[PDB]
Design a protein around this nucleic acid. Structure first.
Ligand code: ATV
Ligand code: ATV
Ligand code: MN
Lengths: 95, 87, 106, 96, 96, 82, 106, 95
DNA sequence: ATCAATATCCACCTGCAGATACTACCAAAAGTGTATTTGGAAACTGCTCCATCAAAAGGCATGTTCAGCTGATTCAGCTGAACATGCCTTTTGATGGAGCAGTTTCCAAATACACTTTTGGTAGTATCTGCAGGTGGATATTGAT
DNA sequence: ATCAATATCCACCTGCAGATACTACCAAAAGTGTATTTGGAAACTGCTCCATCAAAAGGCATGTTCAGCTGAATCAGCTGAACATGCCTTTTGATGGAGCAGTTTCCAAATACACTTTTGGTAGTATCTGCAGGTGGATATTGAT
């Protein structure tokens, strides 16, 4: 009776951070779930191709970064680049 | 199982009111009398293409049931990605 | 015992995202920074869309975000609209918009 | 006996349907059309209900988009009435 | 003391250019424009001779097609003269 | 005789492009609109090509950078590699 | 010892196709007959375009195929045209076609 | 110095099988090369996708075939299928 | 009509840029043989969920009537096509030198993997709550006049 | 402007189903900890092909002239919107039976070497040629009369 994984609890967490008394219908969550999986696929997609075009067999944080700039427009890119750089530093600094 | 009743001309259940309502959503104020058939035709080609591909995923999976996933995958292929159904 | 999520100060599951990259066959090897960074980008984006979706819910005297609210958000935001310009949000309808010439009198 | 001048209800309905997100084609009729087309590609097939609903959601989202584009074509022609030529131009430019 | 009627050469030009395949913009002006636009993204950038070439091929192919739909849009409005609104409508329906 | 680079894309050239497109009559305002569109096209394509350059740590845009850019803009070009 | 291309009765390199698949991260494992089928399909499709381009070479008083001949070949065939409907053949130009309403009153 | 691989010779072999008295320029050859790589990637891309959708480790001829069906127009699809079943038959039936 | 200005076409000439030919020649895939690993079809069967069925509840088909939109007609005026006149920028070629791409290093960060811990999904059973859809009743939009 | 029919508002109102709760469980994740392998950054460098600058080539900027297109104004014919009416088909809520999906088996098929053979890429170098860009004279197209 196999486990269908989602991003629901993570979406919900983030939800509570930005709008503490707002909820989300399950159809809305579903879309949210579709959205995450989509963007994941497209960043990973661009990442994949990028590595290949450079005979690099590893996907590093640097690859993901270039995917992000290639995929997202203008400000969403620029901000996403910060937030990811920030977490990589924090993750490094924590070991 | 016994006798699956014959399906024919079901394009004509895409009623004139239903086609008018969609126009309205699309912000259309006035509609020529010929629109309805044209739209029926246009709908039919749209469906053919999305169902062909969907049914191509079903058969590859060796199934008798077209799933929402089959359709979501079919829609992605044609650059009409859909959110809301496991997609 | 500490999560790499907490380690990176993230809500989104770094472990999970690390795994899905392996299983989706995107490359031979996957660096340890990659999922940390991707879970970040993924979290930032869902935050943006929820911020904007929440406002739509509020602008409509509702407390629960429904698909319409997501559609209002995306479609009303130049950038989110482009990101998802070839995406359909089931049950989101359209932006009220009647073309000029269609309106009555003068 | 009161009467609305033509176009007035039309705009009423535009405002109405632009506001909602309900589907506009009755469920069953649409379902049959799906089954009819599917059957021509393949016999003995079943459909998850949500497969039919997925197809309907996409089909209405496509058609509404096309009408937006169609409308713009008519107006480009200094008309306010969409006609098949308007649809065909839209679909040509879209590369359909 | 002899003069061709308006549209005769246009036609003549049409047939000439639909026949051949050379790029119809001068290489240097194009090279400048590409180089200039690139400077806004990164500085001190050299360009492979073939890379510029790729861009011109793509750009012209793009432009030539945009004129086709544009022309379709003029004719839709019962004109024969293309106009910015025709380009504007094409790009809108294309999703640009 | 100073001049802008976008103006270097000249009327006669744009006229010729339209011709290949089968355009017979051309309003005087097309030439500025056309340069508008072309700059937006080149910006969109180059931004991506260079992003590819930078990734590869090069000071040089290679034809492949452009080919790869064209691919993701959905304007696949044949002739220059890949 | 014979090449797999000769065993398949093919001109296309069954060997290479197999190699390019593995080093393409398309899947974990790759079955013995999938490079075979793939290389077949590639050949066939190559043959069609070359066939047709060749014809266009003839039609134009030429023996050597050039881009123009690939363009006329592809764009004159509903199917090859659809398959490549989002592709540009460099140095190919366009099919001679003038909208009828643009022709002078005869 | 490093090798530059290309489908060029196999294209040339095919050319002569169909038009022995017909030649091909470099630029023409190059386009054919693009064409073969592109179709390669598209077919492989879809086949890859199919396999994952069904949670399988292997891209088999079955996957390539469905992939061909999904990507190619009616008549073109039909032949490619027949051409591709032929080659596998010819291969199995052979020591 | 004819008359001529000009474009276009066809046959033939030809030099050389581009394409074929070769062959040293050699690194690096491609094939072969054997030892080893794992994937998925098959045979079984638990169990969701699809088709299939009867009730009521709600929207489609149709005909009448005419408002006003489309498209035909006419025409006057601005606007782009054609084409002279000279003229300033692109094109083509020739040559150091920038950087790309080839090679070897070696080390930080990767994969492999074995035991240990925590988490997220569900599943069973729980009461909590936003808002759909109903109500009337107060006000706006519209179109006759 | 005035009235009056009709839509629109919206604020208050129980019904509930969808959401939020929680308790107990656990399988599969995820984290942790050396053991062992290596991908790619780093540093040094040969040699393309790029930017540059100069000689020659060649097409674009401008202005006059006016043909002919665009769009404004006028119009009737008639198509499509509104709406009354009659009523059939869709919606929605309930109950067995098909197929999917979860096991677990296990052998055919793939991986992983390792070692033996070849071909396909360069590149030296030389050889060959399809056709591009002339030529000229013949006929066709266009446009003035
Ligand atoms: O009363 C009827 C009716 C009566 C008889 C036949 C019919 C056929 C189709 C639709 C309807 C109908 C219909 O919507 N209503 C409206 C009701 C208040 O909800
Ligand atoms: O003689 C000139 C000329 C002279 C002076 C300035 C110029 C500016 C632009 C173009 C040209 C030009 C130009 O094409 N020609 C043609 C010449 C016969 O080959
Ligand atoms: Mn049928």
């Amino acid at each position: 009776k196999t486990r269908k994984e989602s991003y629901a609890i993570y979406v919900y967490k983030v939800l509570k951070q930005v709008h503490p008394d707002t909820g989300i219908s399950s159809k809305a969550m579903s879309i949210m779930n579709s959205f995450v999986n989509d963007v994941f696929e497209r960043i990973a997609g661009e990442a994949s191709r990028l590595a290949h075009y450079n005979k690099r067999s590893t996907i590093t944080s640097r690859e993901i970064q270039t995917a992000v700039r290639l995929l997202l427009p203008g400000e969403l890119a620029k901000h996403a680049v910060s937030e990811g750089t920030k977490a990589v530093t924090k993750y490094t600094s924590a070991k | 199982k016994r006798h699956r009743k014959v399906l024919r001309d079901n394009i004509q259940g895409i009623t004139k009111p239903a086609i008018r309502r969609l126009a309205r959503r699309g912000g259309v104020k006035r509609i020529s009398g010929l629109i309805y058939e044209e739209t029926r035709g246009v709908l039919k080609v749209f469906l053919e293409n999305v169902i062909r591909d969907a049914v191509t995923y079903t058969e590859h999976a060796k199934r008798k049931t077209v799933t929402a996933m089959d359709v979501v995958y079919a829609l992605k292929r044609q650059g009409r990605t859909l959110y809301g159904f496991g997609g | 015992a500490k999560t790499r999520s907490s380690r990176a100060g993230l809500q989104f599951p770094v472990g999970r995202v690390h795994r899905l990259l392996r299983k989706g066959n995107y490359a031979e090897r996957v660096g340890a920074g990659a999922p940390v960074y991707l879970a970040a980008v993924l979290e930032y984006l869902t935050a943006e869309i929820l911020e904007l979706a929440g406002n739509a819910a509020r602008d409509n005297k509702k407390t629960r975000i429904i698909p319409r609210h997501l559609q209002l958000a995306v479609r009303n935001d130049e950038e989110l609209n482009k990101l998802l310009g070839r995406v359909t949000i089931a049950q989101g309808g359209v932006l009220p918009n009647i073309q000029s010439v269609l309106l009555p009198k003068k | 006996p009161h009467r609305y001048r033509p176009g007035t209800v039309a705009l009423r309905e535009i405002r109405r349907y632009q506001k909602s997100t309900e589907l506009l084609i009755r469920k069953l009729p649409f379902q049959r059309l799906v089954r009819e087309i599917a059957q021509d590609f393949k016999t003995d097939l079943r459909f998850q209900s949500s497969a039919v609903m997925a197809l309907q959601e996409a089909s209405e989202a496509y058609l509404v988009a096309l009408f937006e584009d169609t409308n713009l074509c008519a107006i480009h022609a200094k008309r306010v009435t969409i006609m098949p030529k308007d649809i065909q131009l839209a679909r040509r430019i879209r590369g359909e």
